[PDB]
Amino acid sequence: TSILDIRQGPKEPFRDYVDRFLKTLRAEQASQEVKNWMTETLLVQNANPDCKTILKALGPGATLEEMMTACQGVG
């Protein structure tokens, strides 16, 4: 019930993690601008090590769709 608790499994597809992250985010008490910032930063911090390293290599400013494209088939 906290967005801080949604972490990607070591063999979970990135998009099934994003599904659980966005459903939990909808329930989180925070401003819409803080939710949009979590979607960029917390989604990367809570990714599994293989996706995390790919996402750090895109850097900030990657959109959510760009992040998902970069992680297809990883794990």
Smallest separation (angstroms) from its own copies to the CB of 15 = 24
Is the Cβ of residue 13 or residue 24 nearer to its own copies in the bound state? 24
Q: Which pairs with CB-CB distance under 8 Å and at least 24 residues apart come from 17-20?
A: 17/47, 17/48, 18/43, 18/64, 18/68
Give residue 3's region: left, alpha or beta (phi > 0; psi -120 to 50): alpha
Is the Cβ of residue 41 or residue 69 nearer to its own copies in the bound state? 41
Binding site for its own copies (CB under 8 A): 2-4, 28-31, 33-34, 37, 41-42, 45
Smallest separation (angstroms) from its own copies to the CB of 3 = 7
